[PDB]
Design an enzyme around this catalytic site. Structure first.
Site, short mmCIF file in Angstrom:
data_model
loop_
_atom_site.label_atom_id
_atom_site.label_comp_id
_atom_site.label_asym_id
_atom_site.label_seq_id
_atom_site.Cartn_x
_atom_site.Cartn_y
_atom_site.Cartn_z
N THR A 241 2.11 43.75 -14.32
CA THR A 241 1.98 45.18 -14.52
C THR A 241 3.05 45.73 -15.45
O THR A 241 4.01 45.01 -15.83
CB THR A 241 2.05 45.97 -13.20
OG1 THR A 241 1.61 47.32 -13.42
CG2 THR A 241 3.42 45.96 -12.60
N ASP B 102 -0.92 48.74 1.08
CA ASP B 102 -0.28 49.00 -0.18
C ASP B 102 0.28 50.43 -0.13
O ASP B 102 -0.49 51.36 0.13
CB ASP B 102 -1.34 48.91 -1.29
CG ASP B 102 -0.75 48.97 -2.70
OD1 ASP B 102 0.23 49.73 -2.93
OD2 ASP B 102 -1.32 48.26 -3.58
N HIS C 232 2.12 45.86 -1.65
CA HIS C 232 1.56 45.96 -2.99
C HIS C 232 1.66 44.66 -3.79
O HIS C 232 0.78 44.39 -4.62
CB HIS C 232 2.28 47.08 -3.72
CG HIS C 232 1.83 47.30 -5.12
ND1 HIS C 232 0.59 47.84 -5.43
CD2 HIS C 232 2.46 47.08 -6.30
CE1 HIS C 232 0.49 47.95 -6.74
NE2 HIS C 232 1.60 47.48 -7.30
N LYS C 233 2.75 43.92 -3.60
CA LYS C 233 2.95 42.64 -4.28
C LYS C 233 2.40 41.51 -3.40
O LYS C 233 3.13 40.65 -2.93
CB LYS C 233 4.42 42.39 -4.66
CG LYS C 233 5.04 43.44 -5.65
CD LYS C 233 4.22 43.58 -6.90
CE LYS C 233 5.07 44.18 -8.05
NZ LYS C 233 4.33 44.31 -9.35
N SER D 95 -1.89 45.68 -10.52
CA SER D 95 -1.51 47.09 -10.78
C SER D 95 -2.05 47.55 -12.15
O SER D 95 -3.28 47.58 -12.34
CB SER D 95 0.00 47.34 -10.55
OG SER D 95 0.32 48.71 -10.72
N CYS D 96 -1.22 47.87 -13.13
CA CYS D 96 -1.76 48.40 -14.40
C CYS D 96 -2.42 47.33 -15.31
O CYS D 96 -3.07 47.61 -16.35
CB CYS D 96 -0.65 49.13 -15.16
SG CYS D 96 -0.11 50.56 -14.30
#
Ligand SMILES: [Cl-]
Ligand SMILES: [Cl-]
Lengths: 256, 256
Positions: free
Chosen positions: B10, B206, B234-235, B79-80
């Protein structure tokens, strides 16, 4: 007691090598700084911009310059990091409570600065799949290197987990020992570097800085204190992290 | 079956985030590539040199260009990273067996490219101690950011060990979402990005890509398959590495 530890990586590495030790030292109540040296870790420079071990050491010198009067640090250097210690102590030797050498080169004041590197290359001449290149900076031809992945696996990270070795494959970068530049460098001074307290930490299971070399270094320039860590590998801050923290606590309690 | 996984970090991160998953996938017999994107990880560029998400994606595009004919990869974006997937699929959609979104943005083809980022900023407006700056590139003012350490600790690496969080503090770098550039970018195509198989992996624990957001994304653009990982953070490639590997094996066995 609490100290401010400044952790100093070796060539081709970055602050990331200290990712296990730093939180452990902090959990003991210490302040810890883990620097990227020039063209190392996330430093924005490439090695071909760097002309000497002194220029390589800039982030450490800059950091020491920024310490307010009266604040002393304990420098901790791994592998080639002992050279960055010598360089720093000859500029900021009032700021240094002690230096801890962690399977590190141990320069002296009686022989040229390249002396222990020349000896290392005699004892460990075969760097396996390590690749070399040359660049020119400040009128001198410098030999750059990229540590080979088999060398990494077998000799530096011998007993580290696959996830640690993976970090090394991902993050290690082109670097240089600046051996020919060191050879022509003014000697390290007795008044600066020679005056600092020096603690030598090692394991006899290190597969790159072999016992012959490390024991040679200890006899060549007697440390103020020696700690021998049983087992582990060359990266003791990964394989023997708790033991390294314990030693560093004792150093903090001894030297200020 | 074995696949060639291409793992895509990300913003403000690097390949290093995949240091646990990569060896595990390899231990299952897969080929794995973990890239640093522009101005990320050990990439030599600084973010102020980068004018768009497309330019940011260059290392991924270059890598895909270098695949010989007939070789397909499974892209995995965190993520992104889903935006980098969209961009890549619109250039190299014959090379992509599937794309796996890992607590990731899921762009679509019906709304502008910024659509899911705009929505993310509605659902998670407070980035805590994250700092912002502006630079100009290609005549546009771009907002850069440096993820705050408290945001990192509490929201991205919530359940990760201190040694993982330490890596994030050491290695995370200034980045950008290029939100205003995305907003003016041509839409992602139905024929390229729209045609690829899309696997959506998430956890409802998350603390940054919150359930409202992730469930909104799933309803907005139906994935071909959804996997919900229980627990973690989240990770997930750090906290649920074995589970992510298991899912990716199943993907490899399903889509080629
Ligand atoms: Cl002298
Ligand atoms: Cl279209």
């Amino acid at each position: 007691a609490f100290a401010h530890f400044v952790l100093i990586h070796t060539i081709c590495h970055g602050a990331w090598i200290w990712h296990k030790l730093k939180p452990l030292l902090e959990a003991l109540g210490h302040k810890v700084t883990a620097l990227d040296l020039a063209a190392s870790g996330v430093d924005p420079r490439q090695i071909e911009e760097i002309g000497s071990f002194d220029e390589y050491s800039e982030p450490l010198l800059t950091f020491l310059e920024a310490l307010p009067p009266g604040e002393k640090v304990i420098l901790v250097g791994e592998s080639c990091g002992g050279l960055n210690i010598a360089i720093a102590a000859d500029k900021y030797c009032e700021k240094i409570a002690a230096a801890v050498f962690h399977n590190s080169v141990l320069p002296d004041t009686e022989h040229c600065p390249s002396y222990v590197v020349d000896k290392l290359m005699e004892v460990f001449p075969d760097w396996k799949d390590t690749t070399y290149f040359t660049y020119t900076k400040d009128g001198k031809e410098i030999t750059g290197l990229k540590l080979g992945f088999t060398l990494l696996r077998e000799n530096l990270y011998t007993l580290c987990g696959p996830e640690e070795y993976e970090l090394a494959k991902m993050l290690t970068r082109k670097g240089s020992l600046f051996q020919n530049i060191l050879a022509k460098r003014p000697f390290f001074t007795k008044e600066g570097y020679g005056s600092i307290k020096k603690i030598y930490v090692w394991t006899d299971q290190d597969e790159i800085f072999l016992p012959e070399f490390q024991l040679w270094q200890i006899e060549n320039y007697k440390p103020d204190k020696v700690y021998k860590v049983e087992g582990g590998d060359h990266k003791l801050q990964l394989t023997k992290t708790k033991e390294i923290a314990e030693i560093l606590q004792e150093v903090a309690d001894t030297y200020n």
